[PDB]
Amino acid sequence: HLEKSAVLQEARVFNETPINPRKCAHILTKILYLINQGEHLGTTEATEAFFAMTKLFQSNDPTLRRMCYLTIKEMSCIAEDVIIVTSSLTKDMTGKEDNYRGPAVRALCQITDSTMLQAVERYMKQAIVDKVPSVSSSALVSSLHLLKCSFDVVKRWVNEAQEAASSDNIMVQYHALGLLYHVRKNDRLAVSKMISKFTRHGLKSPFAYCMMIRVASKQLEEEDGSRDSPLFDFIESCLRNKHEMVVYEAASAIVNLPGCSAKELAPAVSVLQLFCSSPKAALRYAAVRTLNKVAMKHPSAVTACNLDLENLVTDSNRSIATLAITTLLKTGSESSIDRLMKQISSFMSEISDEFKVVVVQAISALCQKYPRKHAVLMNFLFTMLREEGGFEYKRAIVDCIISIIEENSESKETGLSHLCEFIEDCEFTVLATRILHLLGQEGPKTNNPSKYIRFIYNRVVLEHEEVRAGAVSALAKFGAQNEEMLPSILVLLKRCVMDDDNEVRDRATFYLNVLEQKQKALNAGYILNAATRQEIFQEQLAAVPEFQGLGPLFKSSPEPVALTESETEYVIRCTKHTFSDHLVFQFDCTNTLNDQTLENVTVQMEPTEAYEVLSYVPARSLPYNQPGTCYTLVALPTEDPTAVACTFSCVMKFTVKDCDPNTGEIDEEGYEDEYVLEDLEVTVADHIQKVMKVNFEAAWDEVGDEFEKEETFTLSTIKTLEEAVGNIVKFLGMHPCERSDKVPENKNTHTLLLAGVFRGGHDILVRSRLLLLDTVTMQVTARSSEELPVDIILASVG
Amino acid sequence: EDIQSVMTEVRRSLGEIPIVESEIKKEAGELKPEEEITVGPVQKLVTEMGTYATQSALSSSRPTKKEEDRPPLRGFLLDVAASLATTLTKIALFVAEAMLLMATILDVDRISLCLKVLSDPVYAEAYVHVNQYDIVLDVLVVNQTSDTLQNCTLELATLGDLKLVEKPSPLTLAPHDFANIKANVKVASTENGIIFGNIVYDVSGAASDRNCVVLSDIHIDIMDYIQPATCTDAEFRQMWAEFEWENKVTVNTNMTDLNDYLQHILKSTNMKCLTPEKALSGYCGFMAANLYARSIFGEDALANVSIEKPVHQGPDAAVTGHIRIRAKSQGMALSLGDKINLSQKKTSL
Amino acid sequence: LYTVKAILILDNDGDRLFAKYYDDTYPSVKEQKAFEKNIFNKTHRTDSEIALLEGLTVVYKSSIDLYFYVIGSSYENELMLMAVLNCLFDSLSQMLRKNVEKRALLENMEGLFLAVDEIVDGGVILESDPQQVVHRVAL
């Protein structure tokens, strides 16, 4: 047995020099045992123990060197001092008992601290790197726990650091990479050029391969680029060798075919499937459940029958039993075979590797593929379920019932019919509770009153004040609703059925009394229970008051622009808003880097095609991963030729301040640097409402009358609208028209006579007669109810 | 207030399991005295600490359920004169002090703390007459024979709870002559376990006769045998469930209402339906009828049949009622369900 | 890969005479026993070719006297995983010249211990073949 006490006293054994390595070791062992089994104790005593133990250390008694390692080893994230050895670690360090040296460092590292961290370091560097593979291994492990704590101390070393990871032992080679699990956690790019290194060389450890796979895979999901050759390359690689695991590993993800890859891969897979198909890799079971997914394609499915038939047949191997349920499921089944199986199952399920659990899982799947649906099956199943039984169905029922509800099943009359009956003579009060509750809600939306009543009475029939009680409670939702005959009678019934038995009496009385207390109708009720989208933005913007004009928003942006490209530290997405008077660019964001918070932020814009520039606004502070707002404001000139479409030049200014995210500091100092700000271009669709005309005929002409500018091109290398078309529907954001829009994948002639209204109120109108002689020569008209738009449309459309 | 104080004290004293909301309701009454006679917000605060405590505990997690809450009214229940009072209660749904006390009380927290601390001419015609216990054999052997033709042989036997027991001795088949041959059977003994009878019987070819009849019987059924018998209902229910569950047959279909129909069936089997609740075997009823009977060799058989019942465009001209049959052997029991099934209707046997 | 929840060598009296939770994040000696109980009681000296419990790989074995448990995640292939488990029986057997017994267990723990740390150390299997060991060790 275990107990601390003998040992502390026994520490006086330390006092002897005549000792045998055995004798002491055992004593040492005894303490360790209590602990291996489990012990808990005071530090003071531990400390003491150390001292006591520590005390002994003249020798190199090798054995002695190990035990302590253990002992020490026992302490690592919940320690007591560090310093004591120190010398001893060094002593190894100059000292060639190679062996020993390695264990000791390793413990320290969960226990570690930064100053002390300082210690090893030149050497350490060496040490990780040093000699025989053995020693090196010892070194490695040590960090990791320190990585818990941190490990960055290490980290730093890195450009330089990795390269040594270059290996010549398999075991080792495998190992190097995980540390690279975290290395790749740190970096993706690095991998990529890296891979070409991993990719570059054929590998040693099956083990090494594996991490890569996950990774490799991980990469693949969205696509790991043109895996074609790599994937392929890999594909061999996974595919064959003398180490099975890889082939399989690859296999389970890789399918690809809903009308997709199936080529080589299905055969190879088959070689495997079959090969596995009797517990080579008892692994095979899991896969079918998802890892290697199945829900088939139609001829494909027919082919599957044989393999599943082997498992189905075999009935053995825990790995087998599971396999039977998934394979059968995934591939699906005919009715008929089920029948054979039901009998098989009849024996099987109880224990046949403890079939019941796999089966409950299987069952959970059954309830799902048919959760009261193929009700005939549901009933066949139901009969069978209850029947094959044991008892273990109940658990299943919890799921099954749930499934039926999920559908909100409709062959309830029948479904319910089976349930009702069987449950009656399939017992368990507990089920009733659940079902009651559900039923409780449902009532007269599904009618069949007499039956349902018929049932209900029965349910009550059973004793239990409690059993009885549910029929009344369910009823409240029901009663209230009434059904194909109920209200009159509903009133009659509570009367007809009535009970004593005191608290059972009371239940009748009380419900009544309760009933007594409200107008039963009431009773039931209580108990039972422009100036666009963009304008909104004009207002949203409005809470600020530094304005220099606004108006009401007319239309907003046809496209928000990320003003800082992808996943940048100062990630910007920008949205632009037009009002009848001003345009505001309000800037949406995630000052990205946790490096930074940007401060003293304002936004420069500098313009080419007019706007009067009132102000650049910036956000006061922007910390990491959190929108803040900065704005830039303009007033929109409307009656000029060239005056609201503009590109503005952006430069971000800030005083850049570093962060501690743990607990920061926010101080007046910090220094600016400025980074380029992306262009803003302003559109002819941030401003416009596309329309249909108040008066096309007239308007159409009219707009010409006052307004009209023209451009002609004659098209001699291409006889297609389409280029033009890409620029026009899309740039203007207006409607192509006069039933003069439509073109199939070809068409002889086309007119878009097109619409919307521009900001500042007045309209911008376009007629594009595209004419095909067989060259295209074309008349583009822009006509407008605003001056700035006719010149604009012709440009803007591009 | 005396009562209130007592309640609080006892509650404090206990704690170790229960269930009542219903009780809460029980003390309260439609109205009742509470507080001085009113202390308004403070009184709202009063309701809040005493009730909250009950609740705090309530809010906490569970083992076996005690009862899933349906305290909807519970809510009004906590919050011209009568009308005014109601309004006040709705609004709610010294005072400051009460609130503070309630907060302090807030009892899952307490429980958690405790846990932490712990841590041929001759023509013979025959049929059976069973006349009162005694199944008696009418035999006509009519020997329209040309003489007391020699007759064969007959053998005795143990039977079921009966034994056959008589033979008129001679063996002549007297000429052109008619005879009554009587067999009494012994109706309380001879076990033979060849169920439903249907046991082979011999009349032998043993003398002016080359053959004869060897017969097994059929015609031996239950519906008759059992007599009605009776029970206390609570105990009954308990029992009903308790009994040999193992047989059931369904009622569904006939020619009549279960008034006349039920009566008919009842009389036919000579058996009991134990008790009515007037709920109403008329307007519908939506009645499940419990029946009990005890037989001649003493089996008690239990039924709950639950049945729709005739009535215009309401329900019953089928049933789809289930007849649940309990009789010790399933084999007779189910068979009984059948037997009754035969009994149920009236048609060409 | 910092992947051993524990490796335990359990008696088949549900006892555990070895456990190292290499990695752990749940506790209690009791809960450990309880957890143990559900599964052990259930497997009851019986094991499986494979077993997954918790979506997690359970590779467990039995001997002829002892029950071997490793808990890991079904999130790392059998063949290897087993290989370590295999390694555990075999080396102990050869080296000692005897595999595990209840008896064996009773006379001395240490060797197991010695081995164990060497083979595996936490949630990372540093090694899974005997030989290296065999030379390496010399106790």
What per-residue string of b and e applies to C81-102 under the rule 16 or more CB within 10 Å gives b?
bbebbbbbeebbeebeeebbee
- Please give the Cα distance from B50 to B8 (Å, whole number): 8
For residue A655, the cross-strand partners are A599, A672
Do residues A321 and A352 touch, judged by C-beta distance below 8 A? yes
- Please give the Cα distance from C136 to C139 (Å, whole number): 9
Do residues B171 and B152 touch, judged by C-beta distance below 8 A? yes
- Please give the Cα distance from A93 to A518 (Å, whole number): 90
User: How many CB atoms are closer than 10 A to CB B80?
Assistant: 5
For residue B130, the cross-strand partners are B135
Residue A6 in tokens: 């003998």
**Maximal C-alpha separation, chain A:** 121
Contact check, Cβ <8 Å, C79/A317? no
**Chain A residues 542-581 within an 8 A CB cutoff of chain C:** none
Contact check, Cβ <8 Å, C126/A319? no
C2 contact residues in A (CB cutoff 8 A): 144
- Please give the Cα distance from A187 to A680 (Å, whole number): 33
Tell me the CB-side half-sphere exposure of residue A437, using CA atoms within 13 A: 11
Rounded to the nearest angstrom, the gap between the alpha carbon of residue A457 and the centroid of all alpha carbons in its chain is 49
CA-CA distances (angstroms) from residue C53 to A350, A708, C43, C48, C74? 19, 78, 11, 11, 8
**Helix, strand or coil, per DSSP, at residue C67:** strand
Which residue of chain B has the CA closest to A494? B279
Amino acid residing at A210? C
CA-CA distances (angstroms) from residue A369 to A364, A402, A404? 9, 13, 11
Amino acid residing at B170? P
Q: Is A759 exposed, middle or buried (0-12, 13-18, 19+ CB in 10 A)?
A: buried
Question: Are chains B and A touching, using the cut-off of 8 Å on CB pairs and a minimum of 3 such pairs?
Answer: yes
Size of chain A, expressed as the number of residues it contains: 798
**Chain B residues 178-197 within an 8 A CB cutoff of chain A:** none
Interface contact B154, partner A, CB < 8 A:
no
- Please give the Cα distance from A370 to A655 (Å, whole number): 63
Q: Mention every residue, 6+ apart, whose C-beta is less than 8 A from residue A295.
A: A330
Contact check, Cβ <8 Å, C51/A29? no
Interface contact A291, partner C, CB < 8 A:
no
**Helix, strand or coil, per DSSP, at residue B325:** strand
Q: Is A704 exposed, middle or buried (0-12, 13-18, 19+ CB in 10 A)?
A: middle
For residue A781, the cross-strand partners are A710, A767
Q: Hunting for tokens 């607990």 — which residue is that?
A: A663
Interface contact A210, partner C, CB < 8 A:
yes
**Helix, strand or coil, per DSSP, at residue A298:** helix
Contact check, Cβ <8 Å, A73/C77? no
Closest Cβ opposite residue A282 in set C18, C49, C121: C49
Phi, psi of A681 (to 5 degrees): -120, 145
**Chain A residues 419-448 within an 8 A CB cutoff of chain B:** 421, 424-425
Tell me the CB-side half-sphere exposure of residue A106, using CA atoms within 13 A: 24
Interface contact A286, partner C, CB < 8 A:
yes
- Please give the Cα distance from A280 to A282 (Å, whole number): 6
Q: Is B165 exposed, middle or buried (0-12, 13-18, 19+ CB in 10 A)?
A: middle
Closest Cβ opposite residue B306 in set A449, A454, A529: A454
Vertex A632: Cα angle to A628 and A637 (nearest 5): 150
User: Where does A355-485 have alpha helices with state H?
Assistant: 355-369, 375-388, 393-407, 412-423, 429-442, 449-461, 465-481
Closest Cβ opposite residue B288 in set A451, A461, A514: A461
CA-CA distances (angstroms) from residue C113 to A228, A321, A537, A755? 49, 36, 70, 84
Residue A18 in tokens: 């005549």
- Please give the Cα distance from C21 to C32 (Å, whole number): 10
Phi, psi of A14 (to 5 degrees): -65, -30
Interface contact B324, partner A, CB < 8 A:
yes
Phi, psi of A464 (to 5 degrees): 115, 120
Do residues B303 and B292 touch, judged by C-beta distance below 8 A? yes
Contact check, Cβ <8 Å, C117/A73? yes
Q: Mention every residue, 6+ apart, whose C-beta is less than 8 A from residue A636.
A: A578, A579, A580, A581, A582, A583, A611, A643, A644, A687, A759, A760
Contact check, Cβ <8 Å, B73/A514? yes
User: How many CB atoms are closer than 10 A to CB A359?
Assistant: 24
Q: Is A305 exposed, middle or buried (0-12, 13-18, 19+ CB in 10 A)?
A: middle
Residue A594 in tokens: 């946790």
B288 contact residues in A (CB cutoff 8 A): 457-458, 461
- Please give the Cα distance from B273 to B301 (Å, whole number): 11
B248 contact residues in A (CB cutoff 8 A): 425
Interface contact A206, partner C, CB < 8 A:
yes
Resolution in A: 17.0
Interface contact A25, partner C, CB < 8 A:
yes
Of all helices (H) and strands (E), which one includes residue A780? strand A776-784
A25 contact residues in C (CB cutoff 8 A): 110
Q: Mention every residue, 6+ apart, whose C-beta is less than 8 A from residue C11.
A: C17, C66, C67, C102, C105
Vertex B287: Cα angle to B281 and B288 (nearest 5): 135
**Chain A residues 509-538 within an 8 A CB cutoff of chain B:** 510, 514, 517, 526-527, 529
Q: Of A669, A677, A670, give the one whose Cα is nearest residue A570.
A: A677
Q: Specify the long-range contacts of residues B70-78, CB closer than 8 Å, at least 24 apart.
A: B70/A473, B70/B21, B71/B21, B72/A526, B72/A527, B72/A529, B73/A514, B73/A526, B73/A527, B73/B25, B74/B21, B74/B24, B74/B25, B77/B24, B77/B25, B77/B28, B78/B47, B78/B51
Contact check, Cβ <8 Å, A249/C51? no
A33 contact residues in C (CB cutoff 8 A): 109
Contact check, Cβ <8 Å, C49/A279? yes
Interface contact A175, partner C, CB < 8 A:
yes
Closest Cβ opposite residue A353 in set C48, C76, C108: C48
Q: Of B344, B119, B348, give the one whose Cα is nearest residue B253.
A: B344
Phi, psi of A686 (to 5 degrees): -90, -15
Q: Mention every residue, 6+ apart, whose C-beta is less than 8 A from residue A219.
A: none
Amino acid residing at B338? D
Rounded to the nearest angstrom, the gap between the alpha carbon of residue A758 and the centroid of all alpha carbons in its chain is 43
Residue A403 in tokens: 């499934």
Interface contact A491, partner B, CB < 8 A:
no
Q: Hunting for tokens 């502070």 — which residue is that?
A: A621
Do residues A746 and A721 touch, judged by C-beta distance below 8 A? no
Vertex A398: Cα angle to A394 and A399 (nearest 5): 120
Interface contact B279, partner A, CB < 8 A:
yes
First to last CA, chain C: 28
Residue B87 in tokens: 């309004």
- Please give the Cα distance from B297 to A177 (Å, whole number): 85
Do residues A431 and A394 touch, judged by C-beta distance below 8 A? yes
Residue A506 in tokens: 């009371």
- Please give the Cα distance from A490 to A478 (Å, whole number): 10
Interface contact A314, partner C, CB < 8 A:
no
DSSP string spanning A129-155?
Answer: H-SSHHHHHHHHHHHHHHHHH--HHHH
Best residue of A280, A318, A355 to probe chain C, by most C CBs closer than 10 Å:
A318
Do residues A578 and A534 touch, judged by C-beta distance below 8 A? yes
Vertex A443: Cα angle to A442 and A449 (nearest 5): 155
What per-residue string of b and e applies to A519-528 under the rule 16 or more CB within 10 Å gives b?
ebeebbeebe
Interface contact A134, partner C, CB < 8 A:
yes
Best residue of C46, C78, C117 to probe chain A, by most A CBs closer than 10 Å:
C78
CA-CA distances (angstroms) from residue C44 to A167, A348, C21, C47? 45, 20, 21, 7
Residue B175 in tokens: 């000429």
| All chains having 3 or more CB pairs closer than 8 angstroms to chain A | B, C
Q: Mention every residue, 6+ apart, whose C-beta is less than 8 A from residue B279.
A: A493, A496, A497, A498, B285, B286, B287
Interface contact A284, partner C, CB < 8 A:
no
Of all helices (H) and strands (E), which one includes residue A86? none
Q: Of A540, A559, A533, give the one whose Cα is nearest residue A629.
A: A540
Conformational region of residue A614, where left means phi above 0, alpha means psi within -120 to 50, and beta covers everything else: alpha
Tell me the CB-side half-sphere exposure of residue B188, using CA atoms within 13 A: 3
For residue A575, the cross-strand partners are A586
Which residue of chain B has the CA closest to A425? B245
Do residues A97 and A134 touch, judged by C-beta distance below 8 A? no
* DSSP letter (8 states) at residue C121: B
Question: Are chains A and C touching, using the cut-off of 8 Å on CB pairs and a minimum of 3 such pairs?
Answer: yes
Question: Are chains C and B touching, using the cut-off of 8 Å on CB pairs and a minimum of 3 such pairs?
Answer: no
Q: Is B238 exposed, middle or buried (0-12, 13-18, 19+ CB in 10 A)?
A: middle
- Please give the Cα distance from C78 to A284 (Å, whole number): 10
Contact check, Cβ <8 Å, A249/C114? no
* DSSP letter (8 states) at residue C44: T
Q: How far is C81 from chain A (nearest CA, A)?
A: 10
Amino acid residing at A359? V
- Please give the Cα distance from A349 to A746 (Å, whole number): 65
Do residues A555 and A759 touch, judged by C-beta distance below 8 A? yes
Q: In three state form, how does the secondary structure of B129-172 look? A: EEECCEEEEEEEEEECCCCCCCCCCECCEECCCCEECCCCCCCC
Do residues A144 and A105 touch, judged by C-beta distance below 8 A? no
Interface contact B70, partner A, CB < 8 A:
yes
Q: In three state form, how does the secondary structure of A376-405 look? A: HHHHHHHHHHHHHCCCCHHHHHHHHHHHHH
- Please give the Cα distance from C135 to A9 (Å, whole number): 38
Q: How far is B237 from chain A (nearest CA, A)?
A: 6
For residue A517, the cross-strand partners are none
